[PDB]
């Protein structure tokens, strides 16, 4: 399953969020399977069938109201008959008030159970009417209804593969000139946010490299000598953390291949793809998003990017400073020595 490079999603500012004009939190919900995103919608087919789908939705709302009012009448008449029966029995009027308040409580529940169904059908129709690409649907049941009803009209997806489709269905030159039009004449409050967006978009336009590289289909493995596994004088073994990170990526990617082959429920496959995303995110930059993958002893494992960061990184520790033919000892004053 495709996966995103954590350097361009979680790294500030979010390079993907600047390219697709998507908020960082909305992008977090998409990649990690918390919200679907609309990739395409057949807007002309929707227009040529809007009148028919509107009448069917109106008929469905009418049948929901007719069922509510019928159920409420049967309950209200049963209440009035029970009170009249407990009055013929001669029970105290305070006991009738208990049966009265219970009936009013039951009718309130019936009316509310119907109103919730009416409000869902209002959101289902509202969402399908104003459906455009790059829209997010955080409610999973709502998206399930949209596919069950108007699935012929739109195409949505989750996870990283969806963003891979949004980058594919993305006009680099048009979005570049659209930002330029805002930049030429605009308000500095809303123009500065468009300037920095052009900084990311214009880079993909001129250079000739596709933004598709921010989503990975294959991850490279660093040669073994750079992540060596050494034997210990106690007979046991000590290995580099990178081997654990690669191992967890391999374990979860092979499990995903099993679920795809077995046709397991989409809830297991999606919740597995999310874990594969977090594993590759830890391999490249563990700890960047959320809590870091701890090893034995609550110790955060080092990632590939940790080999280059800070004073202990490759640059400062092994490139800016490194030597043979050298020594050191204590210094003592020598008055007789000459200055040279």
């Amino acid at each position: 399953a495709p996966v995103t490079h954590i350097w361009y999603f979680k790294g500030v500012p979010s390079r993907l969020g600047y390219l697709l004009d998507l908020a960082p939190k909305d992008l977090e919900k998409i990649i990690y399977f918390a919200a679907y995103v609309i990739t395409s919608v057949d807007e002309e087919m929707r227009h040529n069938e809007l009148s028919t789908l509107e009448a069917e939705m109106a008929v469905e709302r009418k049948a929901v109201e007719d069922q509510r009012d019928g159920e409420l009448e049967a309950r209200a008449q049963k209440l009035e008959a029970d009170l009249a029966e407990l009055e013929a029995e001669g029970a105290k009027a305070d006991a009738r008030r208990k049966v009265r308040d219970g009936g009013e409580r039951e009718m309130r529940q019936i009316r509310d159970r119907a109103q919730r169904e009416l409000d869902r059908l209002e959101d289902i129709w509202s969402t399908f009417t104003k459906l455009a690409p790059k829209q997010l649907i955080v409610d999973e049941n709502l998206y399930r209804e949209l596919v069950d009803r108007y699935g012929e009209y739109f195409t949505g997806a989750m996870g990283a593969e969806s963003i891979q489709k949004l980058i594919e269905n993305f006009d680099i030159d048009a979005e570049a000139e659209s930002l330029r039009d805002v930049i030429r004449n605009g308000k500095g409050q809303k123009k500065l946010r468009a300037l920095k967006r052009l900084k990311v978009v214009a880079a993909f336009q001129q250079s000739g490299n596709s933004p598709m590289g921010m989503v990975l289909d294959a991850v490279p493995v660093i040669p073994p000598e750079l992540r060596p596994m050494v034997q210990l004088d106690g007979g046991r073994f000590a290995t580099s953390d990178l081997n654990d990170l690669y191992r967890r990526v391999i374990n979860r990617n092979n499990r995903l291949k099993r679920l795809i082959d077995l046709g397991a429920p989409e809830i297991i496959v999606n919740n597995e793809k999310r874990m594969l995303q977090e594993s590759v995110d830890a391999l490249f930059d563990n700890g960047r998003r959320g809590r870091p993958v701890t090893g034995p002893g609550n110790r955060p494992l080092k990632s590939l990017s940790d080999l280059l960061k800070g004073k202990q990184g490759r640059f400062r520790q092994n490139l800016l400073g490194k030597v043979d033919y050298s020594g050191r000892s204590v210094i003592v004053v020598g008055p007789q020595l000459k200055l040279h």
Binding site: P228, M229, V230, L232, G234, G235, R236, F237, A238, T239, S240, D241, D244, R248, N251, R252, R255, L259, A264, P265, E266, I267, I268, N271, E272, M275, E278, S279, A282, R291, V293, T294, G295, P296, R299, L301, K302
Partner: protein, 174 residues
């Protein structure tokens, strides 16, 4: 119908919303690694989907069957593969870094062998450099140089002693 296949997917998503988060906590205590607990949850619920007998009776607690499957998965992880390796991390302190000796002794021998080699005939030098430097067989050198089998054996037999003469004359230790 197609709704019957979708009812099975809405059934798995149901037991996810009632048991996954509690099963993750249980595996989290037995392993201590959150990334490992997620792997145990996915594998436990995968076996629940493969066993309709556990998903059949709702009047029977399926939670208890999950804790037992996860427990057995965790103890199996705790065997041989973890036994040897899990101990040390090179990134972690307290582990000695690997080192490789210097090539001084090898470079000095190579310099003395290169001097003794120069004092050899072009025939002997071109035979020891094809047997020890190229590692060919006796018949392979005989095929290349267009000479007899015993000719390569004899040239090698002398050239080795010729080199021993030059080295012992320069004081090379036996």
């Amino acid at each position: 119908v197609s709704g019957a296949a979708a009812a099975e997917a809405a059934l798995m998503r149901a037991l996810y919303d009632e048991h996954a988060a509690v099963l993750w906590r249980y595996a989290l205590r037995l392993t201590g690694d959150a990334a490992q607990a997620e792997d145990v949850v996915q594998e436990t619920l995968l076996r629940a989907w493969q066993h309709p007998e556990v998903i059949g009776d709702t009047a029977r607690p399926a939670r208890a069957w999950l804790f037992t499957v996860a427990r057995n998965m965790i103890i199996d992880e705790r065997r041989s593969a973890r036994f040897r390796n899990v101990v040390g991390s090179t990134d972690q302190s307290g582990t000695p870094e690997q080192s490789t000796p210097d090539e001084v002794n090898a470079a000095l021998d190579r310099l003395l062998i290169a001097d003794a080699l120069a004092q050899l005939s072009a025939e002997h030098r071109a035979v020891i450099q094809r047997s020890y430097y190229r590692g060919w067989s006796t018949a392979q050198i005989a095929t290349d140089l267009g000479i007899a089998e015993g000719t390569v054996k004899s040239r090698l037999h002398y050239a080795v002693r010729a080199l021993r003469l030059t080295l012992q004359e320069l004081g090379v230790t036996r």
